[PDB]
Design a protein around this ligand. Structure first.
Ligand SMILES: CC(=O)N[C@@H]1[C@H](O[C@H]2[C@H](O)[C@@H](NC(C)=O)[C@@H](OP(=O)(O)OP(=O)(O)OC/C=C(/C)CC/C=C(/C)CC/C=C(/C)CC/C=C(\C)CC/C=C(\C)CCC=C(C)C)O[C@@H]2CO)O[C@H](CO)[C@@H](O)[C@@H]1O
Ligand SMILES: [Cl-]
Ligand SMILES: [Mg+2]
Length: 255
């Protein structure tokens, strides 16, 4: 239960925040343990409409890191940890980031296994083959609809050599929505040191009924083009798509 430097609620919110009645956002960061945040997924929950929209932020996105200038998005966590990542997201999308969850491999695997695996419909032989290479044959997935365990799901959300980081972000949002779906079919705290978030376990349980009864789940994608001036790769964002995304998330959050 880490406390954000910003204080009580997001500085982007104009009115007082009511976590039980207001639409809210959650930033999910996956750490590859010096440790780096290679997974970056923002989920915005529209309370009134009972909808959630997932957005993967390309780790190479060319964005302003407050106090550091334009750089790769993932460098915000490297420079200033979770606090600076939250600030970078709020400036980039001009929306409040209400909650943040930081996870390493172990928390992810334990969560998946606690849910008795997550359902994924694997469809690409190239993805299957690259995961085999990634894991030196420890993880061998099958095409079709199957339940993956923690080790299999982790390799699935990590692979990328067969296909860009944007396809990896789509595999992350795919697995995230499968985790939510599998938590629906549950009965009714050893993850410490592996899962850090800015709210208590109690407050998290309070949101579970709402999160597990959404009418729709959608994925959003920030489009762009490669920007490689001097041997450093950035992903410049399409400013029209960025604005459309900002408007959609602002409207979803009531701002
Ligand atoms: C040069 C160098 O320094 N080294 C070299 C080489 O390095 C390679 C990598 O090998 C190479 N890797 C690969 C695979 O291809 C690639 O690097 P990479 O892309 O950085 O990936 P990597 O670090 O492996 O794994 C990490 C990738 C990730 C994507 C992060 C995953 C972490 C997670 C935690 C899972 C996230 C999953 C999600 C679905 C997202 C959202 C959910 C969560 C975040 C968590 C929990 C959520 C909960 C509980 C529920 C709450 C729900 C609500 C609140 C609503 O490239 C490198 C460079 O060429 O390594 C060799 C030895 O191995 C060395 O000899 C070499 O010198
Ligand atoms: Cl696939
Ligand atoms: Mg990494």
């Amino acid at each position: 239960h880490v406390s954000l430097a910003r204080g009580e609620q997001s500085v982007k919110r104009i009115k007082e925040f009511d976590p039980g009645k207001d639409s809210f956002s959650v930033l999910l960061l996956g750490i590859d343990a010096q440790a780096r945040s290679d997974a970056n997924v923002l989920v915005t929950f529209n309370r009134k409409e009972k909808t959630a929209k997932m957005l993967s932020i390309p780790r190479d996105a060319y964005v302003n890191i407050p106090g550091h200038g334009y750089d790769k998005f993932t460098h915000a966590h490297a420079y200033g940890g979770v606090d600076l990542t939250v600030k970078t997201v709020e400036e980039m999308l001009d929306i409040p980031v209400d909650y943040v969850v930081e996870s390493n491999f172990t928390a992810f695997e334990d969560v998946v296994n606690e849910l008795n695996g997550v359902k994924v419909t694997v469809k690409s032989d190239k993805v299957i083959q690259q995961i085999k290479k990634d894991t030196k044959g420890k993880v061998v997935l099958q095409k079709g609809t199957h339940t993956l365990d923690g080790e299999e799901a982790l390799a699935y959300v990590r692979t990328r050599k067969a296909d860009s980081d944007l396809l990896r972000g789509q595999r992350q949002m795919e697995v995230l929505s499968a985790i939510i779906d599998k938590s629906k079919s549950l009965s009714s705290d050893t993850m410490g040191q592996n899962l850090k978030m800015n709210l208590s376990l109690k407050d998290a349980i309070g949101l579970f009924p709402f999160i597990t009864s959404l009418k729709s789940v959608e994925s959003i994608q920030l489009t762009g083009y490669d920007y490689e001036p001097a041997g450093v790769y950035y992903f410049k964002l399409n400013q029209q798509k960025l604005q459309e995304v900002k408007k959609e998330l602002q409207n979803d959050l009531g701002v």
